[PDB]
Swiss-Prot record:
Belongs to the aldose epimerase family. The lineage of its organism: Bacteria, Bacillati, Bacillota, Bacilli, Bacillales. The active site is at H176 (proton donor), E282 (proton acceptor). Pathway: Carbohydrate metabolism; hexose metabolism. This is Aldose 1-epimerase.
Length: 322
């Protein structure tokens, strides 16, 4: 059994949807942010939610599940692709970067909903050709559709990227998913053995380095005293196995299993100073500043859509009670 219900969230139209195990709220006007995810049996909120509307507009990438298209930093907001030079807005001034892409603060449309025995589906979409200021930066007819499906104890979260225009473009996507993470009593694991060396502008130097605590990181580890803003390489490309971040809440015995498909080659883990009571394990299809790295696509994860092409990148959050 499952439901959809129109609601108001902090003064903005939103869509609540779910079944007997999980309930989400997505806010289309807010970059199609999944702002709430609730485990029904334990009645626990999994995502960091904003206190007010204004606090969300203050930091719209630090609540819920923000959409990063493209994710993370582009040095100087500048890169070239097949001979052509692009300039994106430099919104991170101290480090002189473009940061976090075009979509986390724009209005998406609800294009459909569907309910059956196979779960409940909410689809949102945004056509970048309809955003004049985005066009000035990225003159391509990219369209992004999100397909959210709740089925049993999993939220599936699929992004379909389309080239409806006349020229090819490169693209990547990531999520700034912000989970509640009480430092004293939660554990975190990640499928990664290596991480990208970063400079003082948080841009990759191009080198990889071993994660020295990789065994604890695989198994599940506390993050007391650790401050993370780290670009990890998924171990999947090299070792196979799983591609996922796990959060374990020790009191209610909840495992949050955040899986991502093979396109998601990198995970940024960010917890600010570690005293903020949250954790963002952010799966990305491409590495920070991928557009500016002369390395193979199997490593950076850079992807290209030719005119008329589409790609679906898949990820999912499963709530296990144990």
């Amino acid at each position: 059994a499952n439901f959809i219900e129109k609601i108001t969230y902090l003064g903005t139209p939103a869509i609540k949807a779910g079944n007997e195990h999980l309930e989400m709220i997505v806010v289309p006007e807010w970059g199609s942010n999944v702002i709430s995810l609730v485990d029904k049996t334990t009645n626990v909120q999994l995502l960091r939610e904003p206190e007010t509307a204004e606090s969300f507009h203050d930091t719209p990438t630090l609540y819920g599940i923000p959409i990063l298209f493209p994710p993370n930093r582009i040095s100087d907001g500048t890169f070239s692709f097949r001979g052509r030079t692009y300039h994106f807005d430099i919104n991170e001034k101290d480090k002189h970067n473009h940061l976090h892409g075009f979509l986390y603060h724009e209005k998406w449309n609800v294009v459909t909903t569907k309910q059956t025995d196979e779960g409940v589906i909410v689809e949102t979409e945004i056509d970048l050709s309809e955003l004049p200021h985005v066009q000035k930066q990225f003159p391509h007819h990219a369209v992004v559709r999100m397909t959210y499906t709740i089925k049993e104890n999993t939220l599936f979260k699929h992004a379909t990227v389309m080239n409806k225009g006349k020229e090819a473009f490169p693209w990547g996507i990531g999520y700034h998913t912000t989970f509640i993470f009480p430092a004293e009593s939660s554990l975190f694991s990640l499928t990664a053995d290596q991480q990208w060396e970063l400079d003082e502008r948080l841009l990759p130097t191009g080198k990889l380095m071993d994660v020295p605590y990789k065994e604890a990181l695989h198994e599940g580890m506390d993050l007391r005293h650790k401050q993370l803003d780290d670009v990890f390489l998924s171990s999947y490309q090299k070792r196979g196995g799983e591609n996922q971040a796990v959060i374990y809440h020790q009191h209610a015995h909840i495992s949050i299993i955040y899986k991502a498909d093979e396109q998601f080659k990198h995970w940024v883990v960010y917890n600010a100073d570690g005293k903020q009571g949250y954790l963002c394990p952010e799966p990305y299809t491409w590495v920070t500043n991928a557009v500016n790295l002369d390395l193979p696509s199997s490593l950076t994860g850079l992807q290209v859509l030719e005119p008329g092409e589409e790609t679906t990148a898949k990820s999912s959050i499963t709530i296990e009670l144990n």
